[PDB]
């Protein structure tokens, strides 16, 4: 093969052992097989190249080929993209992916490509945040008085505020003790985090609020992409989608196993009606639609 291989490079914040890393490695292996060795992918994990914004910057300049980035994370640079991580806008992942393919999604992806040389190949489901507490939460009404810990993130703050709770920003490192001692009444995170940090050990209740649905977009530097042959483009396109279907199924399966596990562990799992939460988010939706000067959210919410 005088033409040699093409060794692409992929950066990620996540570390060996994680689902993101295992999916990246599956992507490396898939590309190498489907190309018969002509496309290889080198992985750089654990933020060895910087954080996600540093890595996107290396994509913009063609110094790095592939990275992950949340759809909503684009709102830092394309303000309307933030609509997709306002709480309760995405109902489930299929809905988030519908937004990615919609006229709105497509307009965000054309701006990503034109302004910053980012070509979004796919969106992969990466889990939904849920709510633990020291008392059961069976409707939005139980949220009143609830000292809910959140990270110091705008949308996490907004979920707790507009649900009626008492937002309590606090460093992740303090959370477990604050729960154990009822300095705080609850917190919110994906289920794997709840398991890994043993928050279920000091929280008797889990509520399936489904308030924040996450993804990871797979993004390739446009400078790389233009350099590639059309067959190589197709192998990459297909492999990313194939690995994303497996990624998405892995996350969904693990969530279902974890809810089952929590129930079997004596965690009390509730399922509040969510239209009351979507309705309680309206003030923020129309504020967002105003500061953007255009009805974005309601269209997205309807998809």
């Amino acid at each position: 093969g005088a033409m040699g291989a093409t060794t692409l490079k992929m950066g990620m914040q996540a570390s060996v052992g994680s689902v993101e890393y295992n999916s990246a490695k599956m992507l490396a292996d898939t590309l190498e097989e489907m190309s018969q060795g002509e496309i290889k992918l080198a992985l750089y994990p654990s933020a060895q190249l910087g954080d996600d914004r540093a890595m996107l910057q290396q994509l913009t300049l063609g110094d790095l080929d592939i990275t992950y980035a949340e759809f909503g994370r684009m709102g830092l640079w394309i303000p309307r993209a933030e609509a997709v991580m306002l709480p309760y806008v995405a109902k489930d992942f299929d809905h988030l992916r519908r937004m990615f393919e919609s006229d709105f999604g497509q307009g965000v992806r054309d701006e990503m490509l034109q302004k910053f040389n980012w070509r979004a190949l796919d969106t992969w489901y990466n889990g939904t945040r849920e709510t633990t507490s020291n008392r059961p939460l069976n409707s939005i009404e139980d949220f009143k008085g609830l000292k809910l810990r959140v990270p110091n993130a705008k949308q996490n703050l907004n979920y707790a505020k507009l649900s009626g709770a008492s937002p309590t920003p606090m460093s992740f490192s303090e959370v477990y003790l604050a729960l154990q001692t009822n300095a705080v009444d609850g917190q919110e995170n994906p289920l794997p985090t709840i398991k890994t940090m043993k928050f279920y050990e000091v929280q008797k209740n889990l509520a399936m609020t489904h308030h924040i649905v996450n993804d990871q977009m797979v993004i390739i530097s446009e400078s790389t992409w233009q350099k590639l042959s059309d067959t190589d483009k197709d192998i990459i396109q297909k492999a990313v989608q194939k690995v994303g279907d497996a990624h998405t199924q892995t996350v969904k399966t693990q969530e279902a196993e974890l809810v089952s596990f929590f129930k079997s562990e004596g965690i009390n799992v509730t399922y509040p009606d969510l239209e009351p939460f979507r309705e309680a988010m309206q003030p923020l939706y129309k504020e967002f639609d105003s500061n953007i000067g255009q009805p974005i959210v309601s269209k997205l919410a309807a998809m």
Partner: nanobody
Amino acid sequence: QVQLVESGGRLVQTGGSLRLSCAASGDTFSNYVMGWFRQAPGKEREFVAAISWTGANSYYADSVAGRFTISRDNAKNTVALQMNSLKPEDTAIYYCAADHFHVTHRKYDYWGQGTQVTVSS
């Protein structure tokens, strides 16, 4: 509206040192890469240097590296270009610019009006 104003242009010696400055206003400074460009009379607008949002990383044109030094003060909303060992070919209008990312495939979003530097001996 982010606005950028450049100061410090002079005429100066060949082999001389000159510090240019840029005052940025209008938005969270640290959300923006800051760049210096320059355009000489017969040539096209040309990249010179750029500095990342925190200053952790910087970028330089080949023609200027090792003797120019870009820096920023996120407390003062300033970016600076320390030019050492100037050379007649450095002569141009120098422009401050801002963007969310450093980019080579297009213009930065925002631009000052520029400051004239001339070096001759």
